[PDB]
Design a protein around this ligand. Structure first.
Ligand SMILES: *Cc1cc2c(cc1C)nc1c(=O)[nH]c(=O)nc-1n2C[C@H](O)[C@H](O)[C@H](O)COP(=O)(O)OP(=O)(O)OC[C@H]1O[C@@H](n2cnc3c(N)ncnc32)[C@H](O)[C@@H]1O
Ligand SMILES: *Cc1cc2c(cc1C)nc1c(=O)[nH]c(=O)nc-1n2C[C@H](O)[C@H](O)[C@H](O)COP(=O)(O)OP(=O)(O)OC[C@H]1O[C@@H](n2cnc3c(N)ncnc32)[C@H](O)[C@@H]1O
Ligand SMILES: *[C@@H]1O[C@H](CO)[C@@H](O)[C@H](O)[C@H]1NC(C)=O
Ligand SMILES: *[C@@H]1O[C@H](CO)[C@@H](O)[C@H](O)[C@H]1NC(C)=O
Lengths: 477, 500
């Protein structure tokens, strides 16, 4: 019944299950093969709007006919919420809403939200080698959900999250009225930058800040074997020191198991905004134990750092293992024996199919108030630990391993609330069935911003049309 | 009004009800009416004043005022900058907690139970009678009641070492709108969080606080350095202070005061210049303070003869006053009407801008006008904005305070002039301070920031976000749980989500 409403309002943009190009659309950005066997990943329909009129028509029809909407930019949702539901749903995919307009003179760019971050980086790089928008590591990440949840990458300690560099946005309201930052008010504008944007509206474009980047950016990857080297108690120094090391430098740690003769390997990877000479000087000054040899570094343009962590046009292809992620915030460093007890669990799974990662939260992330955007994890956070398990299509063993490791780490991590990064979506922390129960997941994502979030939600979508597993609830039923 | 007094006398059956008949009504009302700007006002007169001695009196008062439409203004010390604890635009009665001042100090468990009508001086005295190595960091004014002080945040010379006074609260006792006496466990952690640093008067009546005790070294060093801002480029030390005081050693708190003081020209005449009182407390010996100052601030030229080392309590005496039983007297420096404003600095004030702000001190009488810097470094970085309702934690360089004072002589052209001075200084500083929201410290109450009507939440957010950046929203939630009918209401009280 619903599809008649759409076509009557405003073609060949409606992809029903019968339509011969249906499945290829659906799989293309359902990017978590853990959810492939699910029986909730088949929507009634998929709209790929080209203009805001299509978005308004879709919202109008889906509200008036009991259909749920699954907003999609890139499909990188760790829990795959953007392409599945337990209710009759339809995907509004912003694939073909992706225009990018770069303003070198004003240091800003209007990027339509269905564009990937690799595209934004590429189109900034062909205009300047000294402007950039700092983002996540994965270059296939859609801009829409990325800026909706906020964004952490190798450059966040210098410039903050991606949501800390947003100037304006354009959005489709539950009423279907097109509104930018100026006409929407700054409570809702506050919401969309780092709150659950799918629970506030469908965001079609963002005017985003561009930031200076030196013409020399240096990356490095240092592989060191955790098994026995007492020399790598730099990790011990790293935990208690990396959040206050010079903010141009972000070192990310990855823990996995790899065969050498099965032992535990440590991948120390980093970006530094400056020349290799100065990077070597700084890190030898602070962490002379890592032994970062100059042959382990790479200077270049910023875009080459982007390439390193992913013919100088390689960022425009979105063609590239099932997995689950958990995240945790450390406000005091993990005691050593506890850390080794956590790491030995890596052998409980197949070689290199499980990761434990440290993401540092220093520099500019201290400077920014917990209320600046919905993301509250600013000051006192040493880093964001990521638990990771991988496999292909019993699955319960992988999930049991991840949940066990998390629960072992329980007494040593953030407590009230137990922090959780929104980009690392994790349905275990809580779901919606009212506000008391939903606060369980809300306060973990947003410490006290969750309450402002509910207030804005009740004003903005009182009927709770924009609802999903982790949508901000409304006070009015 | 009649039903109310019959209810009070009937409910819990002595001389704790002070009606207008009672010859000591005026003295009780005046005793903690501590802002002489409000002396000529016609709203500072309650129907009656209750001086509870037990929680039963407070419960009875809440019950009767609920059933007869009477408003309650909780008062502990009366230091409210806007005098809200002794004023209202409606028929109100004061619950004066003066005789709720019992103190139980526990050296071994490092905690103390303070009845809210005790002043901070009394609490300091009773800790000093037990150990010289325990302390409670508080506001500078020792006549400040514990109740309203802990209701708001509380800032002192040790907040950079220990956080706010509200950051060291372990337990509380409370009278809710239902008259139920409640501790931390029975009140819940949403309400327990609320009362610590939110508009605690807007949630209930807090009768006592169990507060954390903190260790202090056996030698604490104060200093006062007089420096001339007018011409001495050395005392452009300020430029460095702004950019360094938030990361200097947290055992150190240096507060600066800018005022106008008469000088003599050396040509015969009296000239008016800007004097700077650079004062500090350091938790440690005088030697370590002097060396620390040479490393961090060689510009003060801080000669040791400007310091005074001693026991911890001696700093309280130094910053209030000789025979050290003087903390049980709740009368202090000589009465002067005043108005205060505040702002939070996230980027250092540009030098010419600070100089132009300071020139405004010359517009008023000599030394009746102040601009002060309270630095926000140290442990105030460590504590999350959501830990208690106070949100001004990390990234704040300091808290600028504007202050203007005067005496009883009014022609109301002078009184209008002083307020215009304070507002002009504020509005000039606007583009250079915290913006959206414009921060404001709750202990420095300022009705100009915005008030409640006499949309609901839209308008209340105006002042709320400045006092409480985003915690204000959580605050309203707990209020709807705790006092949905908004019985505990005043000029800047958290509103309720339910309509009336
Ligand atoms: C897959 C992946 C993800 C990732 C990463 C690396 C890879 C390979 N590295 C990250 C990193 O270093 N740091 C970080 O903080 N996150 C990282 N991620 C996660 C990624 O940032 C997030 O998944 C991202 O926020 C989602 O982007 P994407 O747009 O691709 O994902 P989605 O499923 O389509 O959407 C996510 C949620 O937002 C809602 N949504 C989507 N588009 C919109 C628009 N336009 N308006 C409103 N809401 C929108 C979806 O409904 C879903 O809930
Ligand atoms: C007068 C003064 C104030 C002051 C100061 C020095 C002086 C001489 N120095 C301060 C400083 O260095 N740092 C700082 O942060 N504040 C400083 N102040 C301000 C002072 O702390 C506050 O004005 C404080 O509110 C005063 O406390 P007091 O106990 O005097 O409170 P009040 O005037 O009677 O009432 C004001 C508000 O508090 C509520 N209240 C009072 N008692 C209770 C109880 N028991 N329960 C709940 N609420 C209570 C009143 O209802 C009113 O809202
Ligand atoms: C109370 O304050 C008034 C100010 O209006 C003052 O004149 C009077 O002296 C005070 N009360 C007493 C008993 O002195
Ligand atoms: C009473 O109302 C007036 C409004 O004219 C306001 O200025 C004042 O602050 C209110 N409160 C008191 C205690 O007078």
């Amino acid at each position: 019944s619903f599809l008649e409403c759409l076509t009557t309002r405003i073609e060949s943009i409606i992809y029903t299950k019968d339509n011969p190009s249906y499945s290829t659309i659906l799989n293309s950005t359902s990017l978590n093969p853990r959810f492939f066997p699910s029986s909730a990943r088949y929507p009634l329909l998929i709209v790929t709007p080209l203009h805001a009129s299509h978005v308004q028509a879709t919202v109008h029809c889906a509200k008036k006919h009991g259909i749920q909407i699954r907003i999609r930019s890139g499909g990188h949702d760790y829990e795959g919420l953007s392409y599945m539901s337990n209710v009759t749903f339809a995907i509004v995919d912003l694939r073909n809403l992706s225009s990018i307009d770069v303003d070198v003179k004003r240091k800003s760019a209007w990027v339509q939200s269905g564009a990937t971050l690799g595209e934004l980086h590429y189109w900034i790089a062909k205009k300047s080698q000294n402007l950039a928008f700092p983002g996540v590591v994965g270059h296939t990440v859609g801009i829409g959900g990325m800026l909706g949840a906020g964004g952490y990458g190798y450059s966040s300690r210098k410039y903050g999250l991606s949501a800390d560099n947003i100037l304006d946005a354009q959005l489709i309201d539950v009423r279907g009225r097109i509104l930018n930052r100026k006409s929407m008010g700054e409570d809702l504008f506050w919401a969309i930058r780092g709150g659950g944007a799918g629970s506030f509206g469908i965001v079609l474009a963002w005017k985003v800040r561009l930031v200076d980047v030196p013409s020399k950016v240096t990356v490095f990857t240092a592989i060191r074997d955790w098994d026995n080297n007492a020399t790598k108690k730099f990790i011990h120094r790293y935990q208690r020191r990396i959040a206050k090391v010079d903010k141009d430098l972000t070192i990310i740690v990855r823990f996995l198991t790899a065969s050498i003769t099965i032992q535990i390997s440590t991948f120390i990877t980093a970006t530094y905004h400056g020349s290799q000479d100065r990077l070597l000087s700084l890190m030898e000054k602070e962490f002379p134990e890592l032994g970062l040899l100059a042959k382990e570094c790479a200077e270049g343009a910023w875009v080459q750092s982007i390439l390193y962590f992913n013919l100088d046009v390689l960022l425009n292809r979105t063609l590239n293992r099932a997995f689950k992620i958990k995240s945790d915030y450390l406000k005091k460093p993990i005691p050593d024996q506890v850390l080794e007890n956590l790491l030995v669990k890596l052998y409980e799974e197949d070689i290199g199919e499980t990761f434990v990662e440290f993401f540092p939260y220093g520099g500019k992330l201290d400077e920014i108030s917990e209320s600046e955007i919905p993301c509250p994890h600013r000051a006192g956070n040493l880093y964001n630990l990521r638990y990771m398990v991988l496999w292909k299509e019993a699955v319960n063993k992988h999930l049991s391993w991840i949940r066990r490791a998390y629960n072992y780490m329980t007494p040593y991590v953030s407590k009230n609330p137990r922090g959780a990064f929104l980009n690392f979506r994790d349905l275990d922390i809580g779901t919606n069935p009212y506000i008391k129960q939903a606060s369980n997941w809300g306060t973990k994502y947003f410490k006290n911003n969750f309450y402002k979030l509910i207030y804005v939600k009740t004003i903005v979508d009182p009927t709770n049309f924009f609802t999903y597993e982790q949508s901000i609830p409304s006070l009015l039923p």
